[model samples]
Target: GEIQWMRPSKEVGYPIINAPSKTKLEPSAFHYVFEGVKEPAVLTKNDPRLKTDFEEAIFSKYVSNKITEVDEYMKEAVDHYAGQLMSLDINTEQMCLEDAMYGTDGLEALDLSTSAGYPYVAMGKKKRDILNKQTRDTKEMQKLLDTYGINLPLVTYVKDELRSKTKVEQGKSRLIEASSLNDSVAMRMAFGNLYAAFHKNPGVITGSAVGCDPDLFWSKIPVLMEEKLFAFDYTGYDASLSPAWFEALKMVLEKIGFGDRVDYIDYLNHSHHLYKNKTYCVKGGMPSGCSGTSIFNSMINNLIIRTLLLKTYKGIDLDHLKMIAYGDDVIASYPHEVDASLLAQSGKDYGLTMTPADKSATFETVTWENVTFLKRFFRADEKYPFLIHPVMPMKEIHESIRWTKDPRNTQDHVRSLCLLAWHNGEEEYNKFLAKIRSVPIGRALDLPEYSTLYDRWLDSF
Candidate 1:
């Protein structure tokens, strides 16, 4: 049996949380959580047998024999790229893999999720506990790396360079709007003319099956080794017992002074999740919940994309390339349609998939009907040729106003007014403020002062 899920909160930037409701749950909701797979077997309300059925369904999907195919495919791609990189004269050392792979100390330095400031909800005790365990894991990994004479740096000059050196960075300073509109406008300006020819590709290829695909990601290490990028030789591993990737890791550690301490590389197996009093292990991919996931994934993903870029845009100068990647999302701008298709196929050849044309359109071909990023519409103006404008979509704004009629969302009413005003202009902002002030609750609350102060604070940005 299922129940209806309520509509999500109208708050800006908040994810849709399932709100308890009286109606039956919709099939779309079930499909959203399970993806292509059907929901778990239904039992009588709160029946004990339901947990058993649920676990069966989940394990079948996440931990099937079919995942070994991913391992095979990963090795094939690794061999292909390793040979290709050697032909291109770029080794892992020049690519800054050591700087990227800073062991456990690197994870601690770049721990954004566990860091102090979160805009809305704060991290809880349970999350803190998980972080503490991850920290312990990192320290063990650090000792292992140190023992092998692999002195990884705590400071990341490469990671910092990858993030800041972008068209977006250059466009940000010229923005004249309120500080709140800075990011949206800067993105608009940077991509305004170029947006039409740009492809927004999501890196879902490796980790499409629930958890991350470790084989594909871990293959990078072997690629580095094969390129003769390291001073130490990595070979002759007994892969009969464990996963090939683990053996590769152990082989590297052993070659570089780890020796019998191959047992020290034990952090990869922390993939168990508890559900209904049962513990089940995640089969494939790097551990998703670990603190190091972001740092590791970001570093590796950049290497993959940069490799693909160097491969696809063969003659193009590296400094002149109009490609930028954030984690797995890649944005590539190509003037020639042939170049776009070439890059897409090149990505496929390397085990990455560029999103299809229907789901993602080049900025030039994009219609306003489907133009949205982070739920806000980015509009290009002929007068301001280089910059795009940002606004909450009309349907959302209408829905939010309709929700405000209920009076409980009086706070949200003010929120919408401030948000809309910040983007729309001073005239609309004042009009909305006046309308709110006429209401009894609006007058009773400090909404006028709050709204004005909020507007002023946005000026600081």
Candidate 2:
């Protein structure tokens, strides 16, 4: 189908205008002279002294080269462990821990004490001790690692580093408390925070296992780490199963090296011939409104019929479309354009159509025939094809406004226009007057008249 572009009305210069004075007067007769203008003299744009002070503070506080080393180490570790855990032929829990430890050590080597670059320097001795005790030698850790081919070192060098730094004594109390608790529960909670803090603040973790900024340390480390940990293998496990109860299985898949092969929906559709053996359909409503309820229902109906049609006509079956909650965005992947065509056709068949009143499409490197076919089948207008243009960055918005339109006195005019438009009132087009007003005058253009005209245009929409 033809590509479509949708954005907020503010992005385009619509319902606004610019203009110059209708009559000129002598300099002495200016409005400012009669009013006794009281200008603010202290308005400042940039001060070199202030800029220098800011730069000096940034240079002293910002982490430099150490950040690069930490990031590289973490990336390498994640990659290595991800590969190992996803493999089918040699899956072992022990090997997973061994690989993870190597990565951890690589990260720790970057730093083990308080530093500007470290992310978790504020974590106090009590927390560190708790983390140490849970990881020291637990049955759960032993079981998981032993089953997964992990070969954890009996006495890691990190322990020695911590001892030398005198943290061992400081951590004694928390460690004792951790040891007294049930192993699985305590370790799970502790390791969750531990892994999270490590991943997010790799630059701060010292070889001695102390963070530089412990005050800003994360408490939800496990959740953070879990979110990023992708899975690879799914041989015996049910592909349709929810991820909630499969944390260990998911972790194992991540550790072995087959995390990239699992495609649950694709696998199901292909295996069952759901696409080749089914039929497709479509439905639509609400032309140019922005009510949340209406928008949501429209989107839901659009997606359901689109999927059914794709499966039936194009042999491209898919699972349900994933909707981002409380947002208009939705995501789905199809195998080919045949599926896309089927979707468009279904929309037409169901009388679900959208007009070009507030929509436009642009494309790059697409053929005229392809564009024509898409527009004909989908009932969408193809405006521009085979063109590339970069989007305006956020920083350019203000400059763009100042360059193209004057905002002086425009606010009141815009408010008046909006009030009139809401009541369906009419006025003369006055094209000649609008054109003369839009002329580029000098710096004095920042006046009430210009602002008023601009405001009128803004209120038009």
Q: Which of the numbered candidates is closest to the native, going by highest TM-score?
A: 1
Q: Which parts of model 2 have CA positions greater than 4 angstroms off? A: 1-284, 287-298, 301-305, 308-311, 320-333, 339-341, 354-461
lDDT of 2 at 419: 26
Residue 313 C-alpha lDDT in model 1 = 59
Clashing pairs in 1: 3-25, 4-23, 4-24, 179-461, 195-363, 196-363, 196-364, 212-285, 214-285
How well is each residue in 154-247 modelled by candidate 1, as lDDT tens digits? 1100010011123122211110001111111222222222111111112222211112222222222122211111010101111111233333
Model 2, 14-45: lDDT tens per residue? Answer: 12111111211112212221222221111111
**Best candidate according to lDDT:** 1
Per-candidate TM-scores read: 0.37, 0.19
Give each model's clash number. Answer: 9, 68
Backbone clash total, candidate 1: 9
